Amino acid sequence: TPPSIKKIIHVLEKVQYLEQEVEEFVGKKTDKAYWLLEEMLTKELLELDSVETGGQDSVRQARKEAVCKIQAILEKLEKKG
């Protein structure tokens, strides 16, 4: 059942790096970090959002988890900026 997991995985790694970034985020929306932060995050979300599962347990779990993370990192950034 060759799924699109490759997508959620790629974005997952991207979110990971961003996760560490947001964590180390200077703490000011004026910094370019926040710009590229939300920017890369937004693109990543829209990217994985176009995943084709058609009934895949793997993609399902990864899908929900992906949305949680992206939304998690985004919410964290907004709260810390």
From Swiss-Prot:
Protein name per UniProt: BAG family molecular chaperone regulator 4
Stretches assigned to the BAG domain: 4-81
Subunit structure of this chain's protein: Binds to the ATPase domain of HSP/HSC70 chaperones. Binds to the death domain of TNFRSF1A in the absence of TNF and thereby prevents binding of adapter molecules such as TRADD or TRAF2. Binds to the death domain of TNFRSF12. Interacts with PRKN.
Mutagenesis or variant effect for E39A: Reduces interaction with HSP70
Location in or out of the cell: Cytoplasm
Its job: Inhibits the chaperone activity of HSP70/HSC70 by promoting substrate release. Prevents constitutive TNFRSF1A signaling. Negative regulator of PRKN translocation to damaged mitochondria.
Tissue: Ubiquitous.
Domain of life of the organism encoding this protein: Eukaryota
